[PDB]
Amino acid sequence: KMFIGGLSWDTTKKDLKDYFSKFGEVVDCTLKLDPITGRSRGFGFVLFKESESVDKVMDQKEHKLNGKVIDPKRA
Numbered sequence: 001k002m003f004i005g006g007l008s009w010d011t012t013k014k015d016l017k018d019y020f021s022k023f024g025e026v027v028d029c030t031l032k033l034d035p036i037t038g039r040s041r042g043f044g045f046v047l048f049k050e051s052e053s054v055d056k057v058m059d060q061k062e063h064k065l066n067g068k069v070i071d072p073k074r075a
Contacts, residue, residue, distance in 0.1 A: 001028075002054050005043040005071030006063070009035055013044065019065040020046050024053020042068070045075040 007016060017029035028047030033040035048054040061072040
């Protein structure tokens with residue numbers, strides 16, 4: 001479970017899940033942008049399938065999906 005802060009207002013568990021599908025096999029993914037109630041905090045979560053996959057995406061938190069960076073952490 002790694003946290004991803006920096007998602008855009010139009011981010012989706014799909015674009016993020018895949019952008020991260022390059023690090024390893026993710027079993028879960030989410031987007032914290034409740035843009036319906038006005039709670040789009042451009043920030044969701046990512047749940048890799050194996051630690052190695054997470055440690056990799058963490059080795060380089062210079063991420064930039066949706067045209068923005070993200071705060072990669074231990075979701």
